[PDB]
Design a protein around this ligand. Structure first.
Ligand code: CL
Ligand code: CL
Ligand code: CL
Ligand code: CL
Ligand code: CL
Ligand code: CL
Ligand code: CL
Ligand code: CL
Ligand code: CL
Ligand code: CL
Ligand code: MG
Ligand code: MG
Ligand code: MG
Ligand code: MG
Ligand code: MG
Lengths: 400, 405, 400, 400, 405
C-alpha cells in the first residue's frame, strides 16, 4: 500500500514568494512547484508588511517544505501552523496561507477539477456581490449608487465623508477624525438613502472600529430603523463582549472579523451568536484549510459567511473566495472592487461580477495564476499607510 | 555593586497633615519630607470629616512611616493598606492617598520629570474638560451654558436644580422630621424637561452631562434611563447608589444610555463586578478615596481590559494638588476620557500656586518636575479648618425617610 | 398624635467617647445621655486606630446627634451612615456602632427589658462557646485543651506555632512567616489532635488570610478528613470568588467575615453559599441595627452566625453579641477569651461561660456598662501592632 | 439568672379565635391571654376559609401554647411553624399569624411602647396611602378620582370595568371574562387618565393574574408609556420566571406577592430583581416575625414593600402594617379602603388616612383591639366567593 | 511654561536590530538611539523566526519611529500596535517589544534610576528563582537536583525526559512520516513515577515544578491532574494548549493541583477569559510575545485583581536584557511569584555583560540607571545568525499525526 501512495506522492520541489504592486497595493503571491510539474499559486497578501511575509516564506517555509509530499494538505497545514512554536498572527498565517492555497490549487489541477468541485461541489449557482460607494457628498454617493444599480448590483456598501475639529494645542501628528461627526453624518446618510431609494437595494456600512462601546450601542439603535444589510466592525475585536448589550436591545444585523488571526477571536463570538456574518480574511486565518473548518463551525451556529475581499488581495485570493462561496452552504455574499488594467495583466482571467453575481472558475485548479514576467514590471514599493495612525481630537490613538 | 540600592534610598524624615479652608471647603494636604531634603505633597481631602483624616495621618501613619525608604512606593502602599488589619474606607484611604501622592511627587522630583512622564508618558495631548452649569431656572441655566460655550467647553454638566432644604411645595406628613427635602417625581420631571429644552435650544452644539447623584430608587432609575435616552447624554452619572448597581443590568438590557458611576467607591468590591459586567461606560472614582495614585493606575489598567473609560471625580472639595495629579493620570492612561473642572477662587490659588485652569476646553498636564503644584504653608495658615455640618446629606423624601444623598 | 409621640420622645443630651486600656488592648466605649436621664453604652472598638474613632465621635457624631430623638434608632442609623456622603469603612462604622448600641441600650432600659427580649425574645436557652488554645508545641496545646475540656467547653480553636526561613539578603523590616511551614504544621496539628482526642471535641482553626488561593484549596483538601468545625478566613476578603473551587471539591466547613465593613463584601458571598458561618465584627458593620438585618439575610440563605468576639472588644460588645446570639435563630456559637481583673473592674458584671455556654444578661438594657472613674486609671497607649506588617520570605507584604 | 428570667416570664393562659362579619367580609381575630393579665390581639384573616383557620387555632394551637412563655416570640414562631411537620400554606400561616401578632402586642404593651418603637423606632414620619377607584365607566372613575384627589391622596389604584363574549355552546357555570377586552379597556383607561389628569397623581393598576405570559409582556409594553406607579400581579405566582422577559425589555414598575404563603415563592423573585414592590399579606406569611425578616431581605436587594391591605383584613392587621410601614426603611406605601360603621364598632380607634398619610398608633401595643361583645353581634356567614371560579370564553379555569 | 514639554523631548534618531547567536539560540536585540545621545536596548527574541523580526524592525518600525519623541512610551506603544491594521502575533509583537523595552531603558537612564524604580519601586527584596533539572534517567535527575539544592535553589522544574526524535520503542504505522515522535501514555507514566520517586527521596526539601508543554489531549490532562495531585507540585505548566483552556474548568472543579500557563500567548483574547475565570494560578507569558514592558505592567495589574500570580517565561531563548527586564518587573509587581532561570554561558556573557545570576535562590534587580544590561555590539558581530530548523516542533504521536509541540 505504501508503494501505491508513493507511486502517487507529489514532492514539493520549490517554494517562492513574489511581491508585486501593479496598482495601488502591494500584493503577495506564493508559488509552489512539484516534481510532477504541477505548479500551484496562493495568496499571502498582508499589504502593510509584505517584506515580513516574504522573509517568512523564503527563509523558513521554503526549507521546511522542500521534499515533502504536497498531497497531504491537512498534515502540512497542521505541521506549518505549529512549526515556529509560537503561532497565529498575521505574518505567519499569511505565509502559510500562500502555501496552503497553492497546495489546494495543485490538488485540484491533479484531480482535473475546479477547486470548488474538489470541495464537494456547488451549493449555489453563483454568489451575490456587493460593491463600495464612497464619496464626500451625498450627490457623489448618489452618482456611484446609480451606476452600480444600473450594472445589476443589489447590495452596495455606502460611506459618506472621509475620516473642523477641536484639538488641543500642537496636536500630535496623525490622522484625525471626530466620532460624533462620523455618527451624525452616517445616520443622515442612511436617512437620505432610504428617502431617495426606498427598498431598491440593500445598504451596507462599515464602522471600521471607529467607535467606543457606548457610541456603538447608540449607533445601533439610531440606525436600526434603516435596516442595513449589515453594519460591519461596529466594535474592535478586543471589545466584542459588548455586542451582548446591542444584541439584547437592537435588531441590527452585524458583521465582524476581517481583523481576526487567532481562533480565540471568533469562538466565543460565534458560540454566543454575537454576529450574523463572519468577515474573516482567508489569508489572515491561514488559508483554505481553516476557512473550510470555520465555515462549517459557523453553519452549526447559524452564522453566515462574507469573507473579506478588499483591493489588498490578489485576484487569486478572490477566485479562491468565490470557490469557497459557491461551495459552503452558509456563504452569503462576496465583496468586490473592480480590477484595474495592470492588475489584470499580472493576474489574467480574473472574474468580474455579471448582473450582481460572481461565478466560480470552471477550469481545473483555482483558475487564476500569476504571470511571473508581468509581476516583475511592478516590484514592491514602501507605503506607510498613515491612516492607521488614527487619532481622536485630544490626540489619542483609536483602533483604525 | 551590593551597596547601590541602599545608597540611592530616600529616607522619610517627616510627615505632616494640614487642613486649610481658603474658600468653601476644608481641604487636606499631606506633606512628606526626606532626609535628602526633597518634599512631596499629596491630597487627602475627605471634606466632611477632615479632623478624622488628620488624626489618622498624625497619630498612625506618621510613626509607621518615618525612617522608611520613600523609593519603594509599591511596598509602602501595600503595607499601609493592611496596617490597621481592618481596612478600606474613606478615613484610612484618604490618609494613605495623601502619603502615596507625596511619595510619587518625591520620586518624580528625584527623576527630574513631570509625574506623567514617570508613568510612561502621554497617550494624548491634553484632557478634555467638562464644567458645571447649575441653576434654579432654565434662563439661569442658559446663561451659564452660554458662558461656558464662549470659553470653548464642549461638555457641560447641567442641573435644573435645587433639590433639598425646607419642604416648600412638597406634600410631607404633619410635623416632618428636620432634613433636606426633595421629591423624586418632581426631580425626574424637571430633569427630562431640562434635556428637552436644552436640545431644542442648542441641538448638538455641546455634550450634555447630568448627575442623578443617587437620588432615585431602582424602578425610577430604569424609567429615567428610558425617558432621557433620546436626548443622548454624554453620560448620566450615579443613576443608582453603589449598593444597588446590580440593577444596572436591567438598564443595559434595554437602553443605550451612557452611564458613569463610582465617585463614592472606597472598596474594590464596589467596582469589580461593576466593570467585569460592563455595567458602566465611565468609572468616576475619587482618587484619594481609593487610596491614591498607586491603585488609580491599577484600576485604570483594569478598566482598559474591559473597555471602560475613566472620568475621575474632580469636585471643588479636593486640593489643586489632587487636580494636577488627576491631569497627570489623564494624559497618561489611554482610557482616560474627560476631566471634571470647577474654577479656582483667589484664596485657593494663593494657598496652592500655579494650579492649572482649562484652555479652550482642555486641561494640560504640568511639565515641571514632580506633580507641579504644592501648598504654600504660610498662606494655608491664614485659613484654618472650620466646621461645616453639610446639612444636604440629611436628605429626606416627602414621607420623612432618609434617602442616599 | 404628635403630642403623644413628643410626650414620649427621648432627646439626646450628650455623646462621649472613652478609650481605655485596662489590659492588653485599647478599648473604645461610646456613652449617650438623654433628657430622660437614661444613659446608654456602646462598643466602638477598632483597637488599631482608636484616636481616629474618638475624633469621629467627638468632632462629628456629637454635634450631629445632640437634640435628636433617641427613640428612632432606625432613622438615626440610616441618617448617620450617609451623613459624611462617603461611607462604610472601619472608622465611621465603629463610631456609628458605639452610638447605635447605646441607643438600643437606652430603648431596652426604657422598656425595662433585657436587650434580647426587646428583639423578640430567645430562640435558644444560651449560646455555646469556643475558646482559644494557642501554643508553640503540641504538648503546650494538649495542656490548654485538657484544661478547657475540664471546664466543659466542647469547641476549641487550636493553633500550633506562631507566625528558619530563606529570605533574600538584607530582608525588609517586618513580621516574617513561611506559608508552606504553616500549612505543614497545621495539618500535623489536626492529625495529632484527632489521634489523641478522637471526637471528644470540635476543632476550629483560623487561617487568618495567610495563604494564596492555590494554597487555600490544597489546604482544604488536606484538612477535610479531620472534620474541623470550621476553617476560618481561608482567603482574604478580596479573593472570596476563589471559594467556589473549594466548594466544588471539598466538604470543609468554612467561616469568614471578621474583616468586613462594606455590605458588598458579604452579599455575593452569602447568596452563593460560599461560607457556612459569617464572622462579622458587629461594630465594624455599624452596630446592632445592621447585625439584625444581616442575621436575617443569612437565615434566608442557610448561613449561620458566629460574630467575631476577640479580646479587642469591650465586655459591652460581648454582652450585645450574647443578646444577638440567644435571639437570632441562626446564631451558632460565641467566641470567648477570659477577661482579666482590670477589664472586669472597668466593665463590671461581664458574663463568663458556664459549662461551655454563655447566658444573656437578664437585667434591663445591655446589662454591662463602663465605670467612668475606673476607665480613667487606664488611658489610651500607642501600640504599633507590628504583626500587621506581615511578610513572606522574599520580603513582600501578604494580607495579615 | 433563671430566677430573674422566670421572675419575668409571661405564661400564656388562654388562646381564642373569633370570626366576625361586621360588614362585607368574614374577619378573623386571635386573642392571647397571659398570667400577667396582659391580653394580645392578632389578625388571622383568610376570608375564604375562616372556619378552617378557627379549627386550626382552637383544636391545635391552643393546646400547644397554653403554659408556654409568651416573651419568647422567636422560639414560639419557629416552633409553631414546624409543629404539624408539614407546613407553610394559608390555613396554618394565618392561625400562626394571629398568635404571633398577639404576642408582639403583649410585648409592646409590657414595654409600654407603640409596636413600631419596640421594633427600633420610625424611619419615616408616616406612610403614604393609595386608595381604590373602580367603576364600569370612565366618568364613574373620574368621579371617584376627583373625590380622592380632594382628600389629599396622591396615589390611586384605578380599574375600568368589571371582570359580550363568544363562549362555546352550554358554557360551564363560572365567572367569565375576556382577556383581550380587559387589556384593551385597561390600556384605554390609562390613556384617558393621562389625558385628563396628566401627572397630577400616581396611577396604580392590579392585573390580578388574569393574563397568560405572552399577554403580560404585550401589556407591559403597551402600558409603559403611561408610567404606572406599579402594575400589580401581572403574572400568577407560578409563572414569575416569565418576568425576566418583561424586565429585559420594559421599564414598567412591577408589584407582586399578595398570594404568597411559602418562602420559595419570593426568594428567586427578589434575588433576581423581578419585582419592585413586594405585596405580601402579612398573615399569609405567618405574622410580624417573618414580615420583619422579609422586609430586611428585600432591603438588601433594593426591593420596596407594599403589604397587601384589603378590606378582608382586621383593622388590627391594618394597624400592624402601619407599625411595620413606619419602621421598615424600605416600606413604600399602604393600601387603604375606608372602614364602615359596623367594622369601626367591632374594632375601635382604627386609623384613617389624613391628607394622603397613615399615622402609626402612639399608645402602647398595636393600638387597636376587638370589642368582644360587639363582635358577637356579627357572627360568621358563609360566602362562596364565586368570582374565584374565573373562566375564559372557552370554559377553562384561569387563575382568579 | 508653554515650551517645556517640547524642550524635554527625546527624539528618536536611529533604530537597529541585531541578531546574535553566542551559544545555542538566535537572540534578537533592538537598539534605539536618541538625538541627545541616549541609547536604549530591548529584547525582541522570537528564536524560531529571527530574520522575520529583523525585517519587521528594519523595514517597518524604523521608518515609523524615527523623529518621534521617545518620552511618550504609552502613545508610541498604542500607535505601534495598530500600525499595520492587522495586529497581535509573534512577529509584530516581538519587534514592538524590542522598541518598547529600549524606550523604557532610555526613560530610566534619563531619570537616572533603575527601571523598577520608575515603575514605583520594589514590593519585594528579590525574586525567588527556579531552575531546570532534565535527564533521560532518574539517577541523572537526582544528580542535577542535588547540584541545584547545593546552590540554594528551593524550586526546581524536573523532567524525566526525552520526548521526541526517532520512534525507537513506539508502535508507529509502517513507514511513519518523518518527525519527532513521542508516546503520551509513556510520558504520563514516566512523569507520575518521577514525582513519586522525587517525593520518596526528597520529601518536602524543595518545590517540584513540571512542564507538560501541551503534550496531552484534554482527557489525558484531567487524568494527569488527578494522578499527580497528591505530590503537590508547585505548579504544573501548560497542561493544555492555549486553544483548549476552557477544559481547565473540569480540572478546577475536581483537583487542587496548582496550574501555570501562557508562555505561548500573543493575543489578549488568549488570557482574558483564562484569568477572569481563575483557570490558572500563575500566568507564564513571554514578555516580548505580548509586546513588551508596557503591556506586561497592565497584565500584571489585571492578574492582581483576580488573585493570579506571575511567572514570566524566562527561557535560554531570550536575551539577558530580557531577563533583567523581567527581574525589574518581578521586584516591582506585587503579584510576581518566581523567576525561571537557566545559567548563562561564556559567549553569551561576553555579548551581554553584567547579566545577573541567582544568589542563594534569588535574583536581584539591577541598581544602576536603566535596565542595567546592554549588548556589546562588537562582541555580537562575532556571532552572526545561524539557521536552525528546530525539528522538535514537528511533534508526532505514534500514528503519525501532529500534536501541539
Ligand atoms: Cl505572526
Ligand atoms: Cl500609504
Ligand atoms: Cl404637607
Ligand atoms: Cl454646610
Ligand atoms: Cl471609615
Ligand atoms: Cl503592638
Ligand atoms: Cl395550610
Ligand atoms: Cl360570595
Ligand atoms: Cl512500529
Ligand atoms: Cl534545531
Ligand atoms: Mg471592512
Ligand atoms: Mg457626582
Ligand atoms: Mg479570626
Ligand atoms: Mg391585589
Ligand atoms: Mg514552558
Amino acid at each position: 500500500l505504501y508503494f501505491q501512495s508513493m507511486m502517487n506522492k507529489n514532492t514539493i520541489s520549490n517554494i517562492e514568494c513574489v511581491i508585486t504592486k501593479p496598482d495601488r497595493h502591494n500584493l503577495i503571491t506564493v508559488i509552489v512547484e512539484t516534481e510532477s510539474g504541477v505548479t500551484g499559486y496562493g495568496c499571502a497578501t498582508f499589504q502593510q508588511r509584505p517584506l515580513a511575509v516574504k522573509t517568512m516564506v523564503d527563509e523558513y517555509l521554503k526549507p521546511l517544505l522542500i521534499g515533502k509530499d504536497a498531497n497531504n494538505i491537512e498534515d502540512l497545514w497542521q505541521m506549518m501552523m505549529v512549526n515556529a512554536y509560537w503561532r497565529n498572527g498575521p505574518v505567519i498565517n499569511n505565509a502559510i496561507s500562500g502555501v496552503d492555497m497553492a497546495l489546494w490549487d495543485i490538488k485540484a489541477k491533479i484531480a482535473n477539477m475546479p477547486l470548488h468541485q474538489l470541495f464537494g461541489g456547488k451549493s449555489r449557482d453563483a454568489i451575490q456581490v456587493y460593491t463600495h460607494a464612497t464619496s464626500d457628498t451625498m450627490e457623489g454617493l448618489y452618482e456611484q449608487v446609480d451606476k452600480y444599480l444600473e450594472q445589476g448590483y443589489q447590495h452596495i456598501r455606502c460611506q459618506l465623508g472621509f475620516y473642523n475639529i477641536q484639538t488641543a494645542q500642537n496636536p500630535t501628528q496623525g490622522s484625525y477624525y471626530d466620532q460624533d461627526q462620523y455618527i451624525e453624518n452616517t445616520v443622515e446618510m442612511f436617512k437620505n438613502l432610504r428617502e431617495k431609494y426606498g427598498k431598491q437595494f440593500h445598504i451596507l456600512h462599515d464602522v471600521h472600529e471607529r467607535l467606543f462601546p457606548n457610541q456603538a450601542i447608540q449607533f445601533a439603535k439610531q440606525i436600526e430603523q434603516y435596516n442595513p444589510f449589515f453594519i460591519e466592525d461596529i466594535l474592535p475585536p478586543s471589545q466584542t463582549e459588548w455586542l451582548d448589550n446591542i444584541r439584547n436591545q437592537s435588531s441590527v444585523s452585524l458583521a465582524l472579523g476581517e481583523l481576526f488571526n487567532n481562533p480565540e477571536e471568533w469562538k466565543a463570538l460565534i458560540i454566543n451568536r454575537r454576529v450574523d456574518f463572519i468577515r474573516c480574511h482567508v489569508s489572515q486565518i491561514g488559508g483554505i484549510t481553516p476557512a473550510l473548518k470555520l465555515g462549517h463551525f459557523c453553519e452549526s451556529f447559524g452564522v453566515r459567511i462574507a469573507w473579506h475581499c478588499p483591493p489588498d488581495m490578489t485576484p487569486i485570493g478572490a477566485a479562491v473566495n468565490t470557490h469557497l462561496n459557491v461551495h459552503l452552504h452558509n456563504a452569503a455574499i462576496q465583496e468586490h472592487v473592480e480590477y484595474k488594467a495592470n492588475t489584470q495583466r499580472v493576474f489574467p482571467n480574473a472574474a468580474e461580477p455579471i448582473n450582481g453575481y460572481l461565478y466560480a472558475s470552471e477550469i481545473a485548479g483555482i483558475g487564476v495564476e500569476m504571470d511571473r514576467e508581468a509581476a516583475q514590471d511592478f516590484p514592491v514599493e514602501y507605503r506607510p499607510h498613515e491612516w492607521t495612525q488614527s487619532r481622536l481630537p485630544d490626540g489619542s490613538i483609536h483602533t483604525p
